[model samples]
Target: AARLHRFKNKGKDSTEMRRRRIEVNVELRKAKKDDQMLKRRNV
Candidate 1:
């Protein structure tokens, strides 16, 4: 998370890079949420 934030803070990072990172992070969080939902369903 810190790494992502650092990339965002750095002026060198391109807009495309930032967008890709945001997409990746969003997907990761969505997958995590889905996993938690599955676990809850199982329980």
Candidate 2:
């Protein structure tokens, strides 16, 4: 999470990079949700 925040800060230097950073954040959230779903299924 800290690393992601750091990249977000770095990305603020460029519009293109900031856009990519947001995409990454969205993907990360999706991945986290998938993980939670899988864990619940296993239980």
For each of the candidates, give the backbone clash count: 0, 0
The lDDT of model 1 is: 0.80
Winning model by TM-score? 1
Q: Which stretches of candidate 2 lie above 4 Å from their native place?
A: 1-13
Candidate 1 lDDT for residue 3: 56
The whole-model C-alpha lDDT of candidate 2 against the native structure comes to: 0.79
Please, what are the lDDT tens digits per residue for candidate 1 over residues 3-41? 554555564558758897899999999999999999999
Report how far off residue 34 is in candidate 2 (Å). 0.6
**Residue 37 C-alpha lDDT in model 2:** 95
Per-model CA lDDT versus the true structure: 0.80, 0.79
RMSD to the native, candidate 2? 9.1
